Amino acid sequence: SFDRPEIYSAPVLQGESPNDDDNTEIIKSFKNFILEFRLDSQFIYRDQLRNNILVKNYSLTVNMEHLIGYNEDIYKKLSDEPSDIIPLFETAITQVAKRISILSRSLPTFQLILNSNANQIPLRDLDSEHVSKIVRLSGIIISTSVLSSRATYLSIMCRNCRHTTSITINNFNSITVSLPRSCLSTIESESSMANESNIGDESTKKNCGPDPYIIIHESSKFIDQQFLKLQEIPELVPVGEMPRNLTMTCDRYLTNKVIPGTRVTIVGIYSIYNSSGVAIRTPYIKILGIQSDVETS
Amino acid sequence: GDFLGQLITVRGIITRVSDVKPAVEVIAYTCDQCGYEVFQEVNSRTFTPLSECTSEECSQNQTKGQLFMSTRASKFSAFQECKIQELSQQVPVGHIPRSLNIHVNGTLVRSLSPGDIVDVTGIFLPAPYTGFKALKAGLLTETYLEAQFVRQHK
Amino acid sequence: QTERVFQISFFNLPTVHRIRDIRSEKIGSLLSISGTVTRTSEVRPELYKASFTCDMCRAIVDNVEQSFKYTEPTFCPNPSCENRAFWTLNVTRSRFLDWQKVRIQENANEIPTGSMPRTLDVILRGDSVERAKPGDRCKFTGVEIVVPDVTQLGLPGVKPSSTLDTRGISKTLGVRDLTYKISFLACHVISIGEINELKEMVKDEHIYDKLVRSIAPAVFGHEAVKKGILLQMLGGVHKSTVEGIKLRGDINICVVGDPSTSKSQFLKYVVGFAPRSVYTSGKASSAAGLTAAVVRDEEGGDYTIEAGALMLADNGICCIDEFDKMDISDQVAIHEAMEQQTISIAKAGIHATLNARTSILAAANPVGGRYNRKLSLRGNLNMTAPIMSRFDLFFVILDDCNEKIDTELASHIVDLHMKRDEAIEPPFSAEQLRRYIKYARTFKP
Amino acid sequence: LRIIWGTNVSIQECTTNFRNFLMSFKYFINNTTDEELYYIKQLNEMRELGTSNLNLDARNLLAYKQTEDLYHQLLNYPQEVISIMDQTIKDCMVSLEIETKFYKVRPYNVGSCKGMRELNPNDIDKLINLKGLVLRSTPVIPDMKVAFFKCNVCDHTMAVEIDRGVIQEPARCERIDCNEPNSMSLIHNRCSFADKQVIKLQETPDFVPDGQTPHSISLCVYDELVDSCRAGDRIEVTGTFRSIPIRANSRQRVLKSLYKTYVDVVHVKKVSDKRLDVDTSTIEQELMQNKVDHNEVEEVRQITDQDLAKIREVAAREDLYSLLARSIAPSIYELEDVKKGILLQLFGGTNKTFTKGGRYRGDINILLCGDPSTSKSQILQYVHKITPRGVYTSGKGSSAVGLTAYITRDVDTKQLVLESGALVLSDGGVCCIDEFDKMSDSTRSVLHEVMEQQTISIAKAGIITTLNARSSILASANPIGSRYNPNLPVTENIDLPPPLLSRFDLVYLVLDKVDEKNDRELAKHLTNLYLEDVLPVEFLTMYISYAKEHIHPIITEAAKTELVRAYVGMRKMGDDSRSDEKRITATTRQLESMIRLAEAHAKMKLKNVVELEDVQEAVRLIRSAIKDYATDPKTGKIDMNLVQT
Ligand SMILES: [Zn+2]
Ligand SMILES: [Zn+2]
Ligand SMILES: [Zn+2]
Ligand SMILES: [Zn+2]
């Protein structure tokens, strides 16, 4: 009738010398950038982060061309493999804000909103090249769906044995984590009396069932997700053809920022999802920034 | 069973004493990629060694180093196991004397020898069942005694 | 029409290595070793080049090299199928070889001080099978190999282990144990250890006396025992009647004396001279070590018999010292070997009849230390009546006190110590005498 | 002062600290070798001889002021200190092939400690020394160092190095053209291996706490120290203290929390100043193998020329025979005739080998009959402790299986192995049987062959072979009833068949008489010991080993005449008293006994010639042992008025 053993660590020695394309070095270079980069004599991003934390907006808006004059390597990587770098750049901001809150007196992952002023590919100039890459687009909004609920933290329980665990999601861009198919009590032979409670009932093996996990909703947390459609400017369209449109997805601090009838600049990732032909996929854009030309007052 | 988890003293005679061997409590590992040190806790009679690194750096980077055991850093204890039997004047009329198990750790080893009459202070604690499966009904457990202070009558 | 398997055989190397000198820096090289053979197995087929069928597609892959293990193909040859793990075996169209296993032991003269003999497993292939008999001294030329060994899990020390390198694999567990023991695979097997002289011997008309005077030269006198031993080395005739009654043709001798008499030197002479002879003592021998024992093969599916003293002396002489310290259980087996020439085995569900056509040389101590001249022979011995009846000759050695004989005996004993081996000058040598005995046994009077 | 993590060692500090000591060492002191630069002779002679191992005593360093620190550090971190000590050598050697040859050190004087079972878990990875008797050793085991991989799609061969036991198998072929996943195969016989052997040792500590039964220890010897130890050997071993976790069973990768213990041997010592040197006549081929294997384990001891000069200076002494007999047991007030037999037993007869097969050995066998309450028991103990190989047996405590051989189950490998017995472990030594008369006829049976041919023949399940038992027998027997009765014959006083009594070379009748000046001397002798010339132990053992090693005596005709005359005279006596077992009848073994004793007496005093004096002394001793100078040849009775002390 014993307890759960633990695993813990502590730094001792210098390991192998660090390769510059290491993830930790990327996080450290981006944390240096945040608190170092200067324009004129004001440290813009530290001040911005402090002010945003005062008003409970957990986000940072970064102008993309400010980094192509500080560290071009991490710029090339971001424009080439955005899905791998964005999660890493989202750790440094949380780490900095953690210190700021503690010294200026439950913080979720911080959202990175990208705003840019550069080349703009038209909506009809999209091909196989731009897949898993960052593009800049202009157009008009015609649709905005209703906000949907998606999980970030899930607490679950097994309906047969009563084993409990948790799940954390920090990747909401796909439109995926799922609930475990088998009870995790058997693979985590953790306690000395637990593997003994797993037996009995004459001669047989504890079988919980095909999918036995129930979600305890009062102990879970959620976020908002939206769908939008962008249309090409109805003026520079081929004569006698229907205008083409694209489907875009956004969440957290980008929702309810626009209304249909607005002309906008969007920065995002060109990706696909599965929905006649041997192997065909449907494209869509993950939103990373919104800028409106001018709004109808 | 009323006496489990308490501090109790016993009176008996020692029948067998085992040698002194090391018992592992925390195992130490060294990663060449990061230079951290991983410490694994053991409280069973059998355990499974770790394979991959669980450091923060290795946990983040895709490249994860391989673990090796460092004997010197580990946590070790001195272990002995003793059997104690009833005195003749305590056995009921017509029955045979019974036995019990005692555990010793630390600087209290090499203090009991076979053939001694003693009074042992210990903590009465349970252990997992080790009998036949077909004869198991419920959550049955075994008992052992954790030595803390030894008195000898001679 | 298949191709013929070819085998190469090297021999006549410069040096021969002892079993207790094999090291691990000679692994996979050519060497020659010596030893004594105890156990052999039956001949069984071995997988050499196999044919496999694909389970995704049905293609045929032929002539896969096995190399000491059950190897499977690692890539479908069709540029389309991507099968690498799923295969089935056509046992009808695969090529086999012949396979036997032999067990060897260290020779008596090569054992160090205070230690026990060592063993080694020898593998034979092809045409080399069935050349080694139990109880032989052979020289092997071959290659020193390593085979898996799961008995080492428990020995102290660091035992090497294998794992796959995870540095370089793109991601978004097969540990194997390297424990081996040293074995031997052989390509050449040899068993080690003119008419002018034979026709010269046959003529001499004092040949009998010379032969008598050439036996056990180190012993002084006792000519009757010398004659008996020769007649026992030569033999009689084996006959069979119409009714299947078998008439026996082996001579059995017993020498009776007290611990003072020189009766063990006769036995030691015969165990050093005769081709197939074994020396055993009363209280250092068990029944299983005389008749036979049954052991099971690791390969599985069969069993093997291991020979005892009586089987290793088939068509030969078995020497037993201290016959009076034998048990009734052993004596009932010796009687079976003497009336019948068979040994019966029934243990663990194995039935087997084995051949023991052997002669018995036995030395017995009087019942009370000394021989009582006032009692009969039966009163002085401790044997079962069935055993005593089937002995042909009983020789009793008694002591006499005569001065001239004592002078001669003492002179002889001191001469041997002073002059080493230049104190015998026998009529014939051992190599001469073996040839004559071999020639003599082929006559049927 | 860089400190290696987890230690207090600075590599540069210790290397520089070590090279000054190695280039300058100091120390009833001489002026020839005790005041010269010591270790540069040791290195120069090493490189000259073509040798690779330096043997480094330890207490050398606990005096020289600098390297005191290094002694404590060597007894605590053997792994890190011994790699510093080698780089000093191969640097020091060229400072004086030597650019491609590897050097080693071997500490052999670590002291203190009080046995394996007194060591705690805090003594893991420490240097300790052990003494004991070897029983078993497993055959050589191959250990992998470099592995061989073949690409089955491109035939590119790769080699890998073991790193602390683990092998890294490449996932992708290394060829830039053939880059396949999982194409690497292992070919076992193309790999590089090394040697490993496991020994089992019966520990013989000095302090035995109350109620410790003997136990056994496991030792791992690698590379050079293979076949350097044989069962029956009493050795001294230096090594490290380790621990290892074991797997619960073959199928599962699960381990057991309680650890297993053993010792990594670094140095082995097979000599002692206070014991005799092994018989080279029995290990001829091991000496040849050691040179072929280049292991510098020294079996025999070194003799300087001052000490060898002392040897002949003493060997010239007039009273050598009395002096040697006196210094055998310097604390047993007893007749010199009894001690002379032990002295000549130690020298042993000349071993002779015929070139047509046929071996004659020179082992002496002695029986000590006589009243109880004598010092027979001490003689056997003293001889047990001076001879290199021996076992002590009781009468009614032995079995034939326990004396010859047996099969046992090894708790490590769980298989059945063969193990040696009492008499085979005593090969080239002395076996002491106490209370011989109380032993069964079944157990007495096995001794006949050992006393006749010095072999044993075993036909049991698994073994059919002949074993070598070249041992000396020293036996003591108790007389029937209270005391020896002079009125009865000897054959009626000892419960042993008269035919068996004739197999012994010497039979000693130890009789007790009441006489006032003998009693006075014995009482003063004993009382002098409870208060607060002779040859010390070292010199005695050295002399005996020298004689047993070099000289070899051969007999002459003048001796032959006397031998034959003596044998005939002995047989002619009592020719009428043979039917009645009054006296011990004479046989040919007595002739051989005279031969053996003459050769042993010749070997003493360092001759190669057995002259007439030797045979006369041998016959004198044989008669004096049986007390034939006081026996009535008709009745077999002893006149005690004539038995003088
Ligand atoms: Zn469950
Ligand atoms: Zn790591
Ligand atoms: Zn296929
Ligand atoms: Zn390849």
CSV table of C-alpha atoms in Angstrom, one decimal, chain C residues 18 20-25 27-28 68-69 74-75 84 105-108 111-118 144-146 148 150-169 175-178 180-182 217-218 258-261 264-265 268 278-281 283-286 288-290 293 306-309 312 321-322 325 365 368-370 399-403 406-407 409-411 413-418 420-421 424 426 428-430, chain D residues 137-144 152-153 162 164-171 180-182 186 188-189 193-198 218 220 222 226-227 230-231 244 246-247 250 253 260 262 282-283 285-286 289 293 352-356 360 389 400 405 412-413 415 418-420 424-425 427 441-442 445-446 448-449 452-453 455 457-467 470 498-499 502-503 554-557 560 563-564 567-568 571-572 575 581 587-588 591-592 595 599:
chain,number,residue,atom,x,y,z
C,18,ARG,CA,45.4,-27.3,-25.5
C,20,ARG,CA,42.8,-24.8,-21.4
C,21,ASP,CA,44.7,-22.3,-23.5
C,22,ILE,CA,41.9,-21.0,-25.9
C,23,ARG,CA,41.6,-17.2,-25.7
C,24,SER,CA,39.1,-14.7,-27.3
C,25,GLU,CA,41.7,-13.0,-29.5
C,27,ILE,CA,38.1,-15.8,-32.6
C,28,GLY,CA,37.4,-16.6,-36.2
C,68,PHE,CA,24.3,-20.0,-38.3
C,69,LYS,CA,20.8,-18.5,-37.8
C,74,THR,CA,15.0,-8.0,-45.9
C,75,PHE,CA,13.5,-6.7,-49.2
C,84,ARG,CA,10.2,-6.5,-45.6
C,105,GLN,CA,36.8,-33.5,-22.8
C,106,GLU,CA,40.3,-32.6,-21.7
C,107,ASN,CA,43.0,-35.4,-21.7
C,108,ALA,CA,44.1,-36.8,-18.3
C,111,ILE,CA,44.9,-31.2,-16.4
C,112,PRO,CA,46.5,-28.6,-14.0
C,113,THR,CA,47.1,-29.1,-10.3
C,114,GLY,CA,43.9,-29.3,-8.2
C,115,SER,CA,41.4,-28.6,-11.0
C,116,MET,CA,38.7,-30.5,-12.8
C,117,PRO,CA,38.4,-31.2,-16.6
C,118,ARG,CA,36.9,-28.8,-19.1
C,144,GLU,CA,36.6,-20.8,-33.3
C,145,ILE,CA,33.1,-19.4,-33.2
C,146,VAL,CA,30.7,-17.8,-30.7
C,148,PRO,CA,24.4,-17.1,-27.9
C,150,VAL,CA,21.5,-17.0,-21.9
C,151,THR,CA,23.0,-18.7,-18.9
C,152,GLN,CA,25.3,-15.7,-18.2
C,153,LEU,CA,22.5,-13.5,-17.0
C,154,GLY,CA,23.3,-13.5,-13.3
C,155,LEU,CA,27.1,-13.5,-13.4
C,156,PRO,CA,28.9,-10.5,-11.9
C,157,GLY,CA,30.3,-7.7,-14.1
C,158,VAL,CA,29.0,-5.5,-16.9
C,159,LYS,CA,27.2,-7.5,-19.6
C,160,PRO,CA,27.2,-5.7,-23.0
C,161,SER,CA,23.9,-4.4,-24.4
C,162,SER,CA,22.7,-3.0,-27.8
C,163,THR,CA,20.4,-0.1,-28.6
C,164,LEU,CA,19.5,2.0,-31.7
C,165,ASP,CA,20.7,5.6,-32.1
C,166,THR,CA,18.0,8.2,-31.8
C,167,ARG,CA,20.2,11.1,-32.9
C,168,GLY,CA,19.2,11.9,-36.4
C,169,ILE,CA,15.7,10.5,-36.5
C,175,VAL,CA,17.5,-3.7,-26.6
C,176,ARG,CA,19.3,-7.0,-27.3
C,177,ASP,CA,21.8,-8.8,-25.1
C,178,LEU,CA,25.3,-9.5,-26.4
C,180,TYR,CA,28.0,-15.4,-26.1
C,181,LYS,CA,30.1,-18.6,-25.4
C,182,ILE,CA,33.0,-20.1,-27.3
C,217,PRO,CA,58.1,-56.3,-17.4
C,218,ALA,CA,58.2,-54.0,-14.3
C,258,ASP,CA,45.9,-58.6,0.3
C,259,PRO,CA,46.9,-54.9,0.1
C,260,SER,CA,50.5,-55.9,0.4
C,261,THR,CA,50.7,-57.7,-3.0
C,264,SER,CA,47.3,-53.4,-9.2
C,265,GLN,CA,50.4,-53.1,-11.4
C,268,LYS,CA,47.8,-50.6,-14.8
C,278,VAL,CA,39.0,-48.8,-18.9
C,279,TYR,CA,40.1,-48.6,-15.3
C,280,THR,CA,37.5,-48.2,-12.6
C,281,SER,CA,37.6,-48.6,-8.8
C,283,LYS,CA,33.9,-46.9,-4.3
C,284,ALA,CA,34.6,-44.2,-6.9
C,285,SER,CA,32.1,-45.7,-9.4
C,286,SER,CA,28.3,-45.7,-9.5
C,288,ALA,CA,25.1,-45.3,-14.0
C,289,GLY,CA,28.8,-44.8,-14.6
C,290,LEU,CA,29.2,-48.5,-15.4
C,293,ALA,CA,22.9,-42.8,-18.7
C,306,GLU,CA,26.1,-41.7,-22.8
C,307,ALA,CA,28.4,-44.6,-22.5
C,308,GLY,CA,29.8,-46.1,-19.3
C,309,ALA,CA,32.8,-48.2,-18.5
C,312,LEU,CA,33.6,-48.1,-23.6
C,321,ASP,CA,40.2,-52.7,-8.8
C,322,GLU,CA,38.8,-53.7,-5.4
C,325,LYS,CA,33.7,-53.1,-2.4
C,365,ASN,CA,41.0,-58.5,-1.4
C,368,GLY,CA,39.6,-60.6,6.4
C,369,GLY,CA,42.6,-58.7,5.0
C,370,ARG,CA,44.7,-61.9,4.9
C,399,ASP,CA,54.0,-64.7,0.3
C,400,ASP,CA,57.0,-66.9,0.8
C,401,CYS,CA,60.1,-66.2,2.9
C,402,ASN,CA,63.2,-67.2,0.9
C,403,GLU,CA,66.5,-65.4,1.0
C,406,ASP,CA,64.5,-61.5,-1.6
C,407,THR,CA,68.0,-60.6,-2.8
C,409,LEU,CA,63.8,-58.7,-5.7
C,410,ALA,CA,65.7,-56.0,-3.8
C,411,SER,CA,68.3,-55.8,-6.6
C,413,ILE,CA,63.8,-52.6,-7.2
C,414,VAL,CA,67.0,-50.6,-6.5
C,415,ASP,CA,68.1,-51.1,-10.1
C,416,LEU,CA,65.0,-49.5,-11.4
C,417,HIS,CA,65.5,-46.4,-9.2
C,418,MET,CA,69.2,-46.0,-10.1
C,420,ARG,CA,65.7,-45.3,-14.8
C,421,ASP,CA,64.3,-47.3,-17.7
C,424,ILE,CA,64.3,-54.1,-18.4
C,426,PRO,CA,62.4,-56.9,-22.8
C,428,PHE,CA,59.6,-57.2,-27.6
C,429,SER,CA,58.4,-53.6,-27.5
C,430,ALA,CA,54.8,-52.4,-27.1
D,137,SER,CA,36.6,-20.8,-11.8
D,138,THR,CA,34.4,-20.6,-14.9
D,139,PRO,CA,35.9,-21.0,-18.4
D,140,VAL,CA,36.9,-17.8,-20.3
D,141,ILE,CA,34.0,-15.6,-21.4
D,142,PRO,CA,34.3,-13.4,-24.5
D,143,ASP,CA,33.5,-9.7,-23.9
D,144,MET,CA,32.7,-7.4,-26.8
D,152,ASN,CA,22.7,-5.6,-46.6
D,153,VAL,CA,21.8,-3.3,-49.6
D,162,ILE,CA,31.5,0.1,-26.7
D,164,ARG,CA,30.3,2.0,-20.8
D,165,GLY,CA,28.7,-1.3,-21.9
D,166,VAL,CA,26.3,0.1,-24.5
D,167,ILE,CA,26.5,-0.3,-28.3
D,168,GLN,CA,24.9,2.3,-30.6
D,169,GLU,CA,23.6,0.6,-33.8
D,170,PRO,CA,23.4,3.1,-36.7
D,171,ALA,CA,20.0,3.7,-38.2
D,180,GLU,CA,18.5,3.5,-46.2
D,181,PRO,CA,16.6,3.2,-43.0
D,182,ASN,CA,17.4,0.1,-40.9
D,186,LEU,CA,25.5,-7.7,-37.0
D,188,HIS,CA,29.3,-11.8,-34.5
D,189,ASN,CA,32.5,-13.5,-35.5
D,193,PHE,CA,36.4,-9.6,-28.0
D,194,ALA,CA,38.3,-9.7,-24.7
D,195,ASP,CA,38.7,-12.1,-21.8
D,196,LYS,CA,36.7,-12.5,-18.6
D,197,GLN,CA,36.8,-15.1,-15.9
D,198,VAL,CA,34.9,-15.6,-12.6
D,218,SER,CA,33.1,-13.7,-6.5
D,220,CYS,CA,36.3,-10.9,-11.8
D,222,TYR,CA,40.2,-9.6,-17.0
D,226,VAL,CA,43.5,-15.4,-16.7
D,227,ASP,CA,44.4,-18.9,-15.6
D,230,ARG,CA,44.1,-22.6,-9.7
D,231,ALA,CA,41.9,-24.4,-7.2
D,244,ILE,CA,25.4,-4.4,-9.7
D,246,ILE,CA,20.4,-8.1,-11.6
D,247,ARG,CA,17.4,-8.9,-13.8
D,250,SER,CA,15.3,-13.7,-18.6
D,253,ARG,CA,13.8,-6.1,-18.6
D,260,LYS,CA,24.9,-7.9,-5.8
D,262,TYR,CA,31.9,-8.6,-6.1
D,282,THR,CA,53.8,-30.2,-10.7
D,283,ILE,CA,53.3,-26.9,-12.6
D,285,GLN,CA,53.6,-26.1,-18.2
D,286,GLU,CA,51.9,-23.3,-16.3
D,289,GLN,CA,52.2,-20.6,-20.4
D,293,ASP,CA,50.8,-14.9,-21.9
D,352,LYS,CA,61.6,-39.6,-11.1
D,353,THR,CA,60.0,-39.7,-14.6
D,354,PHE,CA,60.5,-42.6,-17.1
D,355,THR,CA,60.5,-41.8,-20.9
D,356,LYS,CA,58.4,-45.0,-21.7
D,360,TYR,CA,57.8,-42.7,-9.4
D,389,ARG,CA,48.5,-26.6,0.0
D,400,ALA,CA,34.2,-41.0,0.0
D,405,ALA,CA,34.5,-35.3,-6.0
D,412,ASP,CA,24.5,-17.9,-10.4
D,413,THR,CA,24.1,-19.9,-13.7
D,415,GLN,CA,23.6,-25.3,-14.0
D,418,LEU,CA,32.0,-30.4,-11.1
D,419,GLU,CA,33.9,-29.5,-7.9
D,420,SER,CA,37.1,-30.8,-6.3
D,424,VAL,CA,42.6,-33.5,-5.1
D,425,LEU,CA,42.8,-30.0,-3.5
D,427,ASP,CA,47.9,-32.0,-4.8
D,441,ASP,CA,36.2,-49.2,5.8
D,442,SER,CA,34.4,-47.4,3.0
D,445,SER,CA,39.1,-47.7,0.8
D,446,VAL,CA,39.9,-44.6,-1.3
D,448,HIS,CA,44.8,-47.2,-1.1
D,449,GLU,CA,45.1,-45.8,-4.6
D,452,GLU,CA,50.0,-46.6,-4.2
D,453,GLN,CA,49.9,-44.7,-7.5
D,455,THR,CA,45.9,-40.9,-8.6
D,457,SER,CA,39.8,-42.9,-10.9
D,458,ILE,CA,36.3,-41.7,-11.0
D,459,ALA,CA,33.5,-43.3,-13.1
D,460,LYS,CA,30.4,-41.3,-12.2
D,461,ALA,CA,27.5,-39.8,-14.1
D,462,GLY,CA,29.2,-37.1,-16.2
D,463,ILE,CA,32.9,-37.8,-15.5
D,464,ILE,CA,35.1,-40.7,-16.5
D,465,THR,CA,38.8,-39.7,-15.9
D,466,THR,CA,41.9,-40.1,-13.8
D,467,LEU,CA,42.9,-37.3,-11.4
D,470,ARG,CA,50.3,-36.0,-5.3
D,498,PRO,CA,48.0,-55.3,10.2
D,499,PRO,CA,48.3,-55.3,6.4
D,502,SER,CA,52.8,-51.7,6.4
D,503,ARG,CA,51.9,-49.0,3.9
D,554,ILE,CA,71.3,-39.7,-7.3
D,555,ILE,CA,72.4,-42.9,-5.6
D,556,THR,CA,75.7,-44.8,-5.9
D,557,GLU,CA,76.8,-48.4,-5.8
D,560,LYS,CA,73.2,-50.0,-3.2
D,563,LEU,CA,70.4,-51.1,0.9
D,564,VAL,CA,70.2,-54.7,-0.2
D,567,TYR,CA,66.5,-55.3,3.4
D,568,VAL,CA,67.7,-58.9,3.6
D,571,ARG,CA,63.3,-59.8,6.3
D,572,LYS,CA,65.4,-62.6,7.9
D,575,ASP,CA,61.0,-65.2,9.8
D,581,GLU,CA,50.8,-61.3,14.0
D,587,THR,CA,57.6,-55.8,2.8
D,588,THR,CA,59.0,-54.1,-0.3
D,591,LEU,CA,62.9,-51.0,0.9
D,592,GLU,CA,61.3,-48.1,-0.9
D,595,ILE,CA,65.4,-45.3,-0.6
D,599,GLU,CA,67.4,-39.3,-0.9
